[PDB]
């Protein structure tokens, strides 16, 4: 399905592909138009 | 109509250097102010 979008709240989410617990927060990231998702200096 | 041509000259297939070209972005993640090594095909410098 499809559900709100909680910030600033430790939940669990479900993104198109992306699992895990943590924060959502909006951010500054120039993501390009191809790209999907972002990562860290690690993995 | 597919049509063929009269006086088709055979090709040349002449020689030339690609430097620094080729290289494109292999995935959709994006990264930041960061090194990093792939494996993937790319044209090779030269």
């Known amino acids: 399905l499809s559900t709100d979008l909680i910030k ?30 972002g990562r860290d200096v690690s993995d | 109509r597919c049509t063929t041509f009269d006086d088709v000259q055979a090709p040349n297939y002449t020689q030339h250097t690609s430097s620094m070209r080729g290289v494109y972005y292999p995935d959709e993640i994006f990264r930041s102010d960061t090194l990093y090594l792939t494996q993937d095909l790319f044209l090779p410098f030269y």
């Open chain 1, 8 to 37: 600033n709240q430790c939940v669990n989410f479900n993104f198109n592909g992306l699992t895990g617990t943590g924060v959502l927060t909006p951010s500054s990231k120039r993501f390009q138009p191809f790209q999907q998702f």
